[PDB]
């Protein structure tokens, strides 16, 4: 896939992703907060189309992500992120995609997710997150 | 004065300030680095004119500020920042302004200046700096 | 179980835990580094006995943990940490305990684990980790 790395910011305002209930996660794009101002991140897209878009608008600054979970699996011989779920202090968004494979989860007791980086080919190959106080 | 607060960034690329060798520091503006991209900060200007502009272009990323020093004094009955000096790991820029009053300095053993905030009326009233690893 | 919270330190030198290949993780104790000096953390013990002790001596400071993984499951009706694995930049220690239940893993691209907190009754109920640069 094509790697991407948004870097770190002040916070997260909105997340736009797409998925396919038979394959995995497709496109990924985030609208971060840069010192009180919305910052529109680059839209990282799948080499292919046919996904279902989803917009996750957070009630920034009072609402923030507390846990990120999902599943990684095999699709057409590639290991990818098949499902994703975002749990904030106000609501649970997801799961999105296919909930099959091996599960993973990142609960946060103290701190904030301030950035994303990963890779996307036909699907989201992998991803990492920037953490900060 | 009019307060300003740029917030925090990834680093500093260029600093643009103006001064008057009889009064104090006037305008202040910074070009920060935002995850590898130049970010042009807002130009905070003096209520008045007649200052001498100065551009401090740093050889980012290999060159960074190690110490900030200067003088605070009385001008027309107001306490302001009369002088400023920026010492990097490669060169010393300044002093700029009037070197009279009480001195102050911030040497940094480990860490980086990633943001500025302060206030400017006819002159730079005061300022603070964001520090990060 | 009885909660514990070691707090944060400079690093990790040695980890001492015990487990039972039929049940789950039992005792947990860490020898941290406090500014260049070994700091013997409190030994958090299980309400019961019959576990197999394991000592994980890291080659501090060149050797550090890069990933922590494990399994959480049901034992006598309680959800606990049944297995634990520590992967450093030099070796893999584990798995220890029973590798059954739902898996979890924490890979670290940049940063260090500098502290542990959790709870222990008959077994390790849950745990969290302190991260820093």
């Amino acid at each position: 896939g094509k790697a991407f790395d948004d870097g770190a910011f002040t916070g997260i305002r909105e997340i736009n992703l797409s998925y396919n209930k038979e394959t995995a996660i497709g496109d990924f794009q985030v609208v971060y907060d840069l010192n009180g101002s919305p910052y529109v991140g680059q839209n990282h897209k799948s080499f292919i189309t046919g996904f279902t878009p989803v917009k996750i608008s957070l009630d920034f600054p009072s609402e923030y992500i507390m846990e990120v979970s999902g599943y990684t699996g095999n699709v057409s011989g590639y290991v990818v992120v098949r499902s994703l779920t975002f749990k904030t202090n106000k609501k649970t968004y997801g799961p999105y995609g296919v909930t099959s494979g091996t599960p993973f989860n990142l609960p946060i007791e103290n701190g904030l997710i301030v950035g994303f980086k990963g890779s996307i080919g036909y699907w989201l190959d992998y991803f990492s997150m920037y953490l900060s106080l | 004065g009019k307060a300003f607060d740029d917030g925090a960034f990834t680093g500093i690329r260029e600093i643009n300030l103006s001064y008057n060798k009889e009064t104090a520091i006037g305008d202040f503006q910074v070009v920060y680095d935002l995850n590898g991209s130049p970010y042009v900060g807002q130009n905070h200007k003096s209520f008045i004119t007649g200052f001498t502009p100065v551009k401090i272009s740093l050889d980012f990323p290999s060159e960074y500020i190690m110490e900030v020093s200067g003088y605070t004094g009385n001008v027309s009955g107001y306490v302001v920042v009369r002088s400023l000096t920026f010492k990097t790991n490669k060169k010393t820029y300044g002093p700029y302004g009037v070197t009279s009053g009480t001195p102050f300095n911030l040497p940094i053993e480990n860490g980086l200046i990633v943001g500025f905030k302060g206030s400017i009326g006819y002159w730079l009233d005061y300022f603070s700096m964001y520090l990060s690893l | 179980g009885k909660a514990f919270d070691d707090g944060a330190f400079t690093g990790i030198r040695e980890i001492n835990l015990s487990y039972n290949k039929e049940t789950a993780i039992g005792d947990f104790q860490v020898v941290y580094d406090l500014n260049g000096s070994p700091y013997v953390g409190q030994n958090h013990k299980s309400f019961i006995t019959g576990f197999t002790p394991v000592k994980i001596s890291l080659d501090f400071p060149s050797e550090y943990i890069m990933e922590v993984s494990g399994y959480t499951g049901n034992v006598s009706g309680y959800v606990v940490v049944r297995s634990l694995t520590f992967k450093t930049n030099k070796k893999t220690y584990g798995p220890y305990g029973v590798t059954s239940g739902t898996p979890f893993n924490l890979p670290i691209e940049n940063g260090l684990i500098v502290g542990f907190k959790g709870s222990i009754g008959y077994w390790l109920d849950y745990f969290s980790m302190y991260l820093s640069l």
Partner: peptide
């Protein structure tokens, strides 16, 4: 160097 750093956890997915 002159680039600010922050903690990063991951990756999850393809090795």
């Amino acid at each position: 160097s002159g680039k600010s750093q922050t903690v990063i956890v991951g990756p999850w997915g393809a090795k």
